[PDB]
Write an enzyme that holds these catalytic residues in place. Structure first.
Site, PDB file in Angstrom:
ATOM      1  N   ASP A  81      27.822  94.090  27.140  1.00 17.44           N
ATOM      2  CA  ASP A  81      27.390  92.846  27.760  1.00 17.44           C
ATOM      3  C   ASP A  81      26.095  92.357  27.129  1.00 17.44           C
ATOM      4  OD1 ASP A  81      26.813  90.684  29.339  1.00 17.44           O
ATOM      5  OD2 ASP A  81      26.409  91.841  31.156  1.00 17.44           O
ATOM      6  N   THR A  84      29.237  84.391  26.951  1.00 21.93           N
ATOM      7  CA  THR A  84      27.796  84.272  26.778  1.00 21.93           C
ATOM      8  C   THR A  84      27.366  84.994  25.518  1.00 21.93           C
ATOM      9  OG1 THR A  84      27.345  86.247  28.079  1.00 21.93           O
ATOM     10  CG2 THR A  84      27.579  84.182  29.222  1.00 21.93           C
ATOM     11  N   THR A  85      27.963  86.156  25.269  1.00 21.53           N
ATOM     12  CA  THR A  85      27.897  86.733  23.937  1.00 21.53           C
ATOM     13  C   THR A  85      28.525  85.800  22.915  1.00 21.53           C
ATOM     14  OG1 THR A  85      27.949  88.987  24.809  1.00 21.53           O
ATOM     15  CG2 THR A  85      28.558  88.646  22.504  1.00 21.53           C
ATOM     16  N   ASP A 131      36.160  88.287  37.958  1.00 21.61           N
ATOM     17  CA  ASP A 131      36.535  87.735  36.665  1.00 21.61           C
ATOM     18  C   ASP A 131      37.951  87.187  36.709  1.00 21.61           C
ATOM     19  OD1 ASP A 131      34.075  88.617  35.928  1.00 21.61           O
ATOM     20  OD2 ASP A 131      34.803  90.346  34.785  1.00 21.61           O
TER      21      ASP A 131
END
Lengths: 521, 509
Positions: free
Chosen positions: B47, B80-81, B378
């Protein structure tokens, strides 16, 4: 000290101007502003930021006030004046180093500061209207994107352009001027993107009366209510007697009933139509529409205050009449020439027609999606703000950068007339101008050396005019930065901004110069 | 105080390493970076949002990278990565060259046209979905869960995500935009099993209402949400002086009774049993209702009542006068105090509007449930993302290699200096494929040049390299899928993100 501080003065002038001339105008680049050492914020237009930025040099100290001084005045020159604040310093920096005494030509740059205002006389256009600042279309179109505004990028503009310039509108409680107060207006995204329309008076942003409300009451005497009618609990209402289990419930119910007659009294007293920024309970709203009264509730405060300043004088936004409007004492009488509730943008807005006592207009912009409402948002803003300096300033400076080269040579003409030293005071002055073409070329990824030099070639003798730009100066671009015309591209100013930023930068250079000794007890 | 090219460097500089190490962490096949605390605290994560944190952060644009990252961590939290990869890709390539070619500007612009071409290609490269067929949706969720390698309970939670989130989806601007999430209500529950959970109608009230005198079950009494103003009025309509003495106790408390009732009789006018009292709560208010044998649930959140506003689909009522079902407790509706585990749970079901359910979660206990919930979280969002976007794309290099051609085809056709971004844009698509080629652990230059050809004829419509299949492949047969927006949402960000730091030449304190 001496130069070293006056340089450090001059340096700080250059040093901070580094931030802005990249950040400059809506050619500028957004810049990270750390608040302490840790909290970073980002815009262009240093005028905003240097206020928020800690100014660590006495120059930087002496400046942000002056830009704010300019910025208190007007948003124009703010991020600018710090420019030529820096310019003439570096310019005059070596002059004093040459033979010049800082006093010698510094009066001249003021005398030079006057030539421009001597030229400001001969260069202005008192017609601020038909060509428009950023033209007409170019005004709003630039502050438009091209989305659903784009096809109307020219079309929506001259609408909103000619709108706030003069249309039928109530200025603040109907001031007898051009729409000083902007114009009430709507971007309501829906139907066609082409159906955006100026409408007579004010199409409400409101809760229409849902009780079976009359959807037209002609010539509405208005109560514009910033006051909610609602209800409160009266443990004992009207009457007493219990002849029925009905009558047991009638007492505390009669508090609601006295509104009916009072509304029917209000039907007779203060309004044809009730306009309420607050809620009118359908309970309350019942008391109206049964009398035959259009009663509109939860109206847009913007609308209503503009409908209040539409209606004129007496309004119920003043006193609160309670229990669903306690019968009006007729300080509540508003004015609407007529009121039709018209479906517009696939929705009924009550359309206030002007005012019974006054003109008014909402424009409804009809897009598909908010992306009109997002763009004609700022498209209005510019045009509005453009129009507003158009509104106040009839005299307005034609040309953005074509003045620079004129104002350069204009004084560079008068330069040699002095002879001696202040012939220089008229030069570096006229030199320090061209950074405006520079920074605009710079921030547009352009080069004024091609642009600003191209500027100075435009003249018969001198003027900045949309007569013949092949033989004279007019206008400017941002994305380019070359002279263009007034109805075309070529930029503008209102009349006022210069003398401020002029004298500002005129005073900016001089005073920190005066001090050579920073030192301490 | 920081400047220009050095910012521009520090842009490319930081945003490089910013874009990087978590791509080893990227892919169902991944490489978890270790993170050491200065104390010695060790961390193993894929993450970036987590990786963003323990690392000591100084570069304020890296902070700004953390921003759009958190900004995207707000939006999806996944990618986001992946969003900061491409801005790192973007900022790396064109910037230094084209700023040494003198501009953020043509760089700025062409990413408008980097954006749209793919946005175009997206609608081409992504294919619509059946949100109608949850299985057509399920495979996505089956796909959504497994990059971080969680299947076991999620395989069910996959379905349960589909179920509620289509129901917890009712939202309209009139263009019917559905973001609605807070409708979905989740339940920490002890006992049951991760493989046993459900979605119950309205909004089940779990968190702060165990309240045992709600009664238990409401067959069809109403639940009452009070923006009343039920607070006893010590006078007629008002609150008189306090009670410091015997005389203030008799007269005032009597008038305190009426205002409770006359509103609670207005509450009775909608005939409840359960009244969850939020505004105007009074020690006499519940007591009267408890004397009314109307269970009055106090010491309660309006958040519960907002959950209850979505439990009956209703609103909450400030009206003292004439309280209604459609005012509060819309629809017939239920209220039930249920013990899942032994925790008392108010279940207010049957919203007046259909598409009413909220997610019950049982694990073997709260924790192994939280395993479900976190992954269901998720799972459930991908739904409203597929419910957001009913188009979806063959992923990997297929997603990547598609537009660059059109983009280069543009650059070739556009042949400006904007062509140079479209070149700078072209291969930035292929970095996660490089990561995918990392994910398979293979030779990238080949697979690129190989997949480059795979777009020369096949046009890489479904054809990327999938490191988890290892190979240049149809991503449709292989079934690599995400709702189009998510792709764009990852794609939209980095553009603006790069364009963001593309604006900064100046840090100043």
């Amino acid at each position: 000290t001496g130069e070293t501080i006056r340089s450090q003065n001059v340096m700080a002038a250059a040093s901070i101007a580094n931030i802005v001339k990249s950040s400059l105008g809506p050619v500028g680049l957004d810049k990270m502003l750390v608040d302490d050492i840790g909290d970073v914020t980002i815009t262009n237009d240093g005028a905003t930021i240097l206020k928020l930025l800690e100014v660590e040099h006495p120059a930087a100290k002496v400046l942000c006030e002056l830009a704010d001084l300019q910025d208190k005045e007007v948003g124009d020159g703010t991020t600018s004046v710090v420019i030529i604040a820096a310019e003439l310093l570096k310019n005059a920096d070596e002059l004093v180093k040459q033979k010049i005494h800082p006093t010698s030509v510094i009066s001249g740059y003021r005398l030079a500061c006057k030539e421009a205002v001597r030229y400001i006389n001969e260069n202005l256009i008192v017609n601020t209207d038909e060509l428009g600042r950023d033209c007409l279309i170019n005004a709003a179109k630039t502050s438009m994107s091209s989305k659903i505004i784009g096809i109307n990028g020219d079309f929506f503009a001259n609408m909103v352009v000619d709108a706030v310039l003069a249309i039928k509108y109530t200025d603040i409680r109907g001031q007898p001027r051009y729409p000083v107060n902007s114009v009430n207006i709507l971007k309501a995204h829906g139907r066609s993107q082409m159906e955006s329309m100026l409408i007579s008076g004010y199409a409400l942003n409101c809760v229409v009366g849902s009780q079976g409300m009359p959807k037209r009451i002609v010539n509405a005497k208005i109560a514009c209510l910033d006051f909610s009618l609602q209800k409160t609990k009266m443990k004992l209402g009207v009457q007493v007697v219990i002849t029925d289990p009905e009558k047991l419930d009638q007492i505390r119910q009669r508090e609601s009933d006295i509104t009916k007659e009072r509304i029917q009294k209000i039907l007779a007293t203060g309004a044809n139509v009730i306009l309420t920024t607050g809620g009118i309970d359908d309970m309350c709203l019942k008391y109206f529409v049964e009398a035959g009264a259009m009663a509109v509730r939860r109206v847009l405060k913007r609308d209503l205050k503009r409908i209040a300043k539409a209606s004129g004088a007496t309004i119920l936004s003043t006193l609160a009449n309670l229990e669903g409007e306690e019968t009006f004492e007729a300080a509540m009488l508003g004015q609407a020439e007529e009121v039709v509730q018209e479906r517009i943008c696939d929705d009924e807005l009550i359309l206030i027609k002007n005012t019974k006592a006054r003109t008014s207009a909402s424009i409804i912009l009809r897009g598909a999606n908010d992306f009109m409402c997002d763009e004609m948002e700022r498209s209005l803003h510019d045009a509005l703000c453009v129009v507003k300096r158009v509104l106040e300033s009839k005299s307005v400076v034609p040309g953005g950068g074509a003045v620079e080269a004129a104002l350069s040579i204009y004084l560079e003409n008068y330069a040699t007339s002095m002879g001696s030293r202040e012939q220089l005071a008229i030069a570096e002055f006229a030199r320090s101008l061209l950074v405006i073409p520079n920074t605009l070329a710079v921030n547009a990824a352009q080069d004024s050396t091609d642009l600003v030099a191209k500027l100075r070639a435009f003249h018969n003798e001198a003027q900045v005019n949309p007569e013949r730009k092949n033989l004279k100066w007019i206008g400017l671009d941002l994305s380019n930065g070359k002279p263009r015309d007034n109805k075309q591209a070529g930029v503008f100013e209102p009349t006022i901004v210069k003398v401020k930023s002029l004298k500002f930068a005129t005073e900016a250079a001089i005073t920190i110069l005066r001090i050579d000794d920073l030192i301490k007890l | 105080r920081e400047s220009g090219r050095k910012v521009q460097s520090g842009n490319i500089n930081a945003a490089k390493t910013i874009a990087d190490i978590i791509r080893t962490c990227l892919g169902p096949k991944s490489m978890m970076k270790m993170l050491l605390d200065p104390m010695g605290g060790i961390v193993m994560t894929n993450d970036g949002n987590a990786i963003l944190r323990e690392i000591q952060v100084q570069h304020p644009a890296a902070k700004s990278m953390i921003e759009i990252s958190r900004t995207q961590d707000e939006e999806v939290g996944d990618g986001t990565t992946s969003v900061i990869i491409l801005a790192g890709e973007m900022l790396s390539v064109a910037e230094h060259f084209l700023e040494q070619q003198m501009h953020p500007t043509v760089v700025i612009s062409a990413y408008r046209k980097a954006l749209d071409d793919m946005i175009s290609t997206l609608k081409k490269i992504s294919i619509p979905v059946d949100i109608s067929d949850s299985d057509m949706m399920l495979n996505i969720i089956n796909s959504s869960i497994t990059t971080k390698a969680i299947s076991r309970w999620s395989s069910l939670a996959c379905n349960i995500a589909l179920d509620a989130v289509k129901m917890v989806q009712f939202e309209e601007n009139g263009r019917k935009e559905i973001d609605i999430k807070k409708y979905a209500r989740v339940e920490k529950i002890p006992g049951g099993i991760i493989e046993d959970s459900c979605v119950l109608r309205g909004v089940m009230i779990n968190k702060d209402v165990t309240h045992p005198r709600m009664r238990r079950y409401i067959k069809n009494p109403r639940i009452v949400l009070l923006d009343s103003s039920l607070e006893y009025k010590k006078g007629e309509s008002q609150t008189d002086i306090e009670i410091t003495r015997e005389e203030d106790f008799t007269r005032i408390l009597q008038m305190e009774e009426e205002y409770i009732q006359q509103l609670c009789e207005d509450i009775i006018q909608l005939k409840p049993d359960v009244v969850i009292t939020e505004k105007g709560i009074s020690d006499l208010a519940q007591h009267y209702l408890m004397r009314a044998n109307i269970t009055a649930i106090r010491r309660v959140r309006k958040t519960d009542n907002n959950r209850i506003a979505r439990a009956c689909g209703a609103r909450i009522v400030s009206r003292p006068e004439e309280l209604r079902e459609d005012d509060v407790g819309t629809g017939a509706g239920l209220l039930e105090i249920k013990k899942i585990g032994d925790e008392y749970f108010t279940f207010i079901t049957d919203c007046k509007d259909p598409k009413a359910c909220t997610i019950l979660l049982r694990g073997a206990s709260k924790e192994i449930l939280s395993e479900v919930e976190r992954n269901l979280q998720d799972a459930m969002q991908v739904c409203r993302n597929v419910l957001l976007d009913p188009q979806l794309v063959p992923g990997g290099g297929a997603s990547e290699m598609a537009v660059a051609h059109a983009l280069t085809e543009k650059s070739k056709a556009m042949t400006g200096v904007e062509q140079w971004p479209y070149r700078a844009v072209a291969q930035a698509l292929e970095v996660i494929p490089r990561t995918l080629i990392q994910n398979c652990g293979a030779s990238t230059i080949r697979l690129l040049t190989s997949l480059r050809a795979k777009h020369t004829q096949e046009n890489c419509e479904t054809w990327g390299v999938n490191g988890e299949t290892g190979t240049l492949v149809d991503m449709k047969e292989l079934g690599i899928w995400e709702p189009l927006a998510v792709k764009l949402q990852t794609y939209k960000t980095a553009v603006e993100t790069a364009v963001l730091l593309l604006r900064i030449d100046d840090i100043v304190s």
